C-alpha cells in the first residue's frame, strides 16, 4: 500500500512538462514535483525498511529520465538538486542492497553519469562526484569499468583536444581510491601514476585541478615510496621553463611531496631538485622566490638539508661553498 504510493510518486516525477501559454499551471506542476521529491527524500532518510525490491528499478528510472539529458552549450536546479539528493540518500541507506541494484545500475548508467561530469555547474559536478564515489564503493563489479572510463576521459583531455570541466572532481574521487589501495601496487596503478597523472601537469588548464592532482600524486608516494624518483624527475621535466607564476603551483606540490618523502629516497633526487629550487630563489618574480624561500619554514625539510648540507649548500649558495 505505502509501497505503491512510493512507486506512484516516483513515476509522477518521471513526467516532464511545459506550459507555453499557462505560467500559472506550470508553477503548480513544478511545485507538486518539488513537493513529491522532498517528501521522498524525508521518507527514505528517516524511515527503515522502506526500500523494497520493486522500487529499485523505479528509483533508477526516475533518476535516468530526469538527469540523463542533452547538456547545453542548470536553470531547473531546484528540481535537479532534489533528484541528486534523493538518489544519494537511496545509495547511502542501510537497506540498500547492491546485489539487487546491480541489475539496474550497470555500465550504461555509469557511462551516462560520466557524461554529466562535463556540466558547467559546480553544484552539479559536486553531486555527481559524491554519487560516483558511492557507486564505486558499493559496486565491486563496477570498480574496474569505472577506472577504465575515467582513464579514457583523461587521455582525451591530455592528448586529444577534448576539454573537460570535471577533471578536478574526478581526481578528487581518485584520491579517495588511491588512499585505500592494496599493499603491493598493481602494475596498472603504477602505469596510471606515470602515464596519466604526471602528464596532467603538462596541460595549460592545470590551475583548475592542480590541488586535486597534487593530492593524488602525494597519496601514491604515501603507499609505495619507490615511485618518488620518477615523480620528482617528471615534475622537474614538466617544470615551467619560462619564469611564470605557474611555478608557485609546482613549488606547492613539491613541498607537499617533501613532507612525506623517505630520507633514502630524498637523496636520489635532492640534487636536481635544489638546482631548480636555486633558480626559483633567483627568480625575477617575487612570488616565486617568496614561495621557494618558504621551504625553510619546514622542519622536516631542514633535517633533510642539514643531514645533506654537503651536497645541497654548494648548489644553493655556490658563492659561499664548493663541491
Amino acid at each position: 500500500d505505502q509501497e505503491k504510493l512510493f512507486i506512484q510518486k516516483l513515476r509522477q516525477c518521471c513526467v516532464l512538462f511545459d506550459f507555453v501559454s499557462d505560467p500559472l499551471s506550470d508553477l503548480k506542476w513544478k511545485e507538486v514535483k518539488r513537493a513529491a521529491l522532498s517528501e521522498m527524500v524525508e521518507y527514505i532518510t528517516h524511515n527503515r525498511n522502506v526500500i523494497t525490491e520493486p522500487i529499485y528499478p523505479e528509483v533508477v528510472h526516475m533518476f535516468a529520465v530526469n538527469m540523463f539529458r542533452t547538456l547545453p552549450p542548470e536553470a531547473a536546479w531546484p528540481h535537479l538538486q532534489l533528484v541528486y539528493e534523493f538518489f544519494l540518500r537511496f545509495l547511502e541507506s542501510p537497506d540498500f542492497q547492491p546485489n539487487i541494484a546491480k541489475k539496474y545500475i550497470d555500465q550504461k548508467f555509469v557511462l551516462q553519469l560520466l557524461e554529466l561530469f562535463d556540466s558547467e555547474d559546480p553544484r552539479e559536478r559536486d553531486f555527481l562526484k559524491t554519487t560516483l564515489h558511492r557507486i564505486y564503493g558499493k559496486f565491486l563489479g563496477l570498480r574496474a569499468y569505472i577506472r577504465k572510463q575515467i582513464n579514457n576521459i583523461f587521455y582525451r583531455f591530455i592528448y586529444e583536444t577534448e576539454h573537460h570541466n570535471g577533471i578536478a572532481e574526478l581526481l578528487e574521487i581518485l584520491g579517495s581510491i588511491i588512499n585505500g589501495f592494496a599493499l603491493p601496487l598493481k602494475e596498472e596503478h603504477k602505469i596510471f601514476l606515470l602515464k596519466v597523472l604526471l602528464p596532467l601537469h603538462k596541460v595549460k588548464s592545470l590551475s583548475v585541478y592542480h590541488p586535486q592532482l597534487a593530492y593524488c600524486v602525494v597519496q601514491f608516494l604515501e603507499k609505495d615510496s619507490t615511485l618518488t624518483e620518477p615523480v620528482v624527475m617528471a615534475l622537474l621535466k614538466y617544470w615551467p621553463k619560462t619564469h611564470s607564476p605557474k611555478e608557485v603551483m609546482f613549488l606547492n606540490e613539491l613541498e607537499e611531496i617533501l613532507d612525506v618523502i623517505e630520507p633514502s629516497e630524498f637523496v636520489k633526487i635532492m640534487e636536481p631538485l635544489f638546482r631548480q629550487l636555486a633558480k626559483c630563489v633567483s627568480s625575477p618574480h617575487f612570488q616565486v622566490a617568496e614561495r621557494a624561500l618558504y621551504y625553510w619554514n619546514n622542519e622536516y625539510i631542514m633535517s633533510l638539508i642539514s643531514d645533506n648540507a654537503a651536497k645541497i649548500l654548494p648548489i644553493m649558495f655556490p658563492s659561499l661553498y664548493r663541491n
Partner: peptide, 11 residues
C-alpha cells in the same frame, strides 16, 4: 568534507 577512503577489494 573530503571523500572517505575506498578500500581496494577483489571482485
Amino acid at each position: 568534507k573530503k571523500l572517505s577512503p575506498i578500500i581496494e577489494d577483489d571482485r
